[PDB]
């Protein structure tokens, strides 16, 4: 039942830097009769299983790249990034092995921080076939763009919202919109706006339209 | 050239019970020892069941009796029996081979076949296309739907950047899934661009073309 502690808890890199993980054990997974560490390390790009990227706490799974490097014993181990690239914008993840249960650490995510961006925003009215069950949406998409903080809006009894976690590719973000309605209800009113507020966004940025039907 | 599929998750009712099915390809399928690990909603690693060259089983304390661990070298499969499914069981099953003809390490991982265990029924989803000079821009929305999970593709999968699938959303036991897909506006309407979704187990495949809203009215 050994339990494994990762620090801390989020982070904030970009390309090029150097990158320290931490791992605290409740034990030593360094056994003195063959002088081994049983400890592993991991990488799980979101929405994949993950990959065996460090095990005996220093070897170098097979085409793991060099830029990666497993240090530390015993209980205090070390993973090694030399060049973070954004081709390592994930979570990464210790175990240990020595005895059951294998036991995994808290996990820690290093979101990305390259440029503030420009969020491009798309506004859409319920569908003519929506209405036609009972029920309405609208959908308003922001697209591609850094940071992850910027909230967005006037009655709101009632909405759903969804992120993207980073991309891997361009270092951004992106949102949702469930703007969820009663189907007459959305007939009440006519003028309907969404609106962003950015961090390089004072002047908010909106999309907006009438109800087609007035 | 090791994959590892996994197969028959997605929901249960409490105490019920589920028979996961990995299926391996690709290596001596005997020499290596198995193991399998879940994944909680609160995206948290958890080891399950382990079982060595030699079928010496090995459990996790919170699922000993209710679950057992089972290969069958003769078909390169492996079995993950699950009996009696707490709400905590809720979560992405994955199957792991041994990294080398030694010990459990989780040398090489499936995909992933996620088990749900709400009371809650099984539900289609519907779907609701929406359609509105540089870049035009269209999604495609899946109100209520469960258990999780489903699959959006465009264009039968044929869409590759310039869609931005967005994380479920349940609210009162159904699912909501939006989807924001971009082109040039010369590319629609001039060319056809349809959500196709899949929910399994309800057996239920589903494509909604996306069409323009007309002016109809009477």
């Known amino acids: 039942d050994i339990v494994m502690s990762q620090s801390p808890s989020s982070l904030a890199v970009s390309v090029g830097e150097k990158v320290t993980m931490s791992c605290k054990s409740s034990?030593?997974?360094?056994?003195?009769?063959?002088?081994?560490?049983?400890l592993a390390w991991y990488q799980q790009k979101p929405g994949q299983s993950p990959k065996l990227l460090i095990y005996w706490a220093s070897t170098r799974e097979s085409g793991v790249p060099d830029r990666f490097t497993g240090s530390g014993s015993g209980t205090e181990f070390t993973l090694t990034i030399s060049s973070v690239k954004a081709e390592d914008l994930t979570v990464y993840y210790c175990q240990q092995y020595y005895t059951y249960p294998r036991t995994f650490g808290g996990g820690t995510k290093l979101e990305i921080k390259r440029a503030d961006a420009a969020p491009t925003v798309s506004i859409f009215p319920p569908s003519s076939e929506q209405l036609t069950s009972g029920g309405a949406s609208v959908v308003c998409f922001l697209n591609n763009f850094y940071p992850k903080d910027i909230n967005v809006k006037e009655r709101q009894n009632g909405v759903l919202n969804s992120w993207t976690d980073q991309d891997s590719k361009d270092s951004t973000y992106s949102m949702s919109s469930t703007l969820t309605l009663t189907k007459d209800e959305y007939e009440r009113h006519n003028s309907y706006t969404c609106e962003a507020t950015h961090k390089t966004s004072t002047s908010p940025i909106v999309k907006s339209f009438n109800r087609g039907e007035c | 050239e090791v994959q590892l599929q996994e197969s028959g998750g997605g929901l249960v009712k409490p105490g019920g019970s589920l028979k996961l099915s990995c299926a391996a390809s690709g290596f001596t399928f005997s020499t290596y020892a198995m193991s399998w690990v879940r994944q909680t909603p609160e995206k948290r690693l958890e080891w399950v069941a382990s079982?060595?060259?030699?079928?010496?089983?090995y459990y996790t304390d919170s699922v000993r009796g209710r679950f057992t661990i089972s290969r069958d070298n003769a078909r390169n499969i492996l079995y993950l029996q699950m009996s009696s499914l707490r709400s905590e069981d809720t979560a992405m099953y994955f199957c792991?081979?041994?990294?080398?003809?030694?010990?459990?390490?989780?040398?090489?991982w499936g995909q992933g076949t996620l088990v749900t265990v709400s009371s809650a029924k099984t539900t289609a989803p519907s779907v609701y296309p929406l359609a509105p000079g540089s870049s035009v821009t269209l999604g495609c929305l899946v109100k209520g739907y469960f258990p999780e999970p489903v699959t959006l593709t465009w264009n039968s999968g044929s869409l590759s950047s310039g869609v931005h699938t967005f994380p479920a959303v349940l609210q009162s036991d159904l699912y909501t899934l939006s989807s924001s897909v971009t082109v040039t506006s010369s590319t629609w309407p001039s060319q056809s661009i349809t959500c196709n979704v899949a929910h399994p187990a309800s057996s239920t495949k589903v494509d909604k073309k996306i069409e323009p809203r007309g002016p109809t009215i009477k």
């Open positions: 079982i060595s060259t030699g079928d010496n089983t």
């Open positions: 792991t081979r041994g990294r080398g003809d030694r010990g459990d390490l989780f040398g090489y």
């Open positions: 034990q030593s997974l360094l056994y003195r009769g063959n002088q081994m560490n049983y």
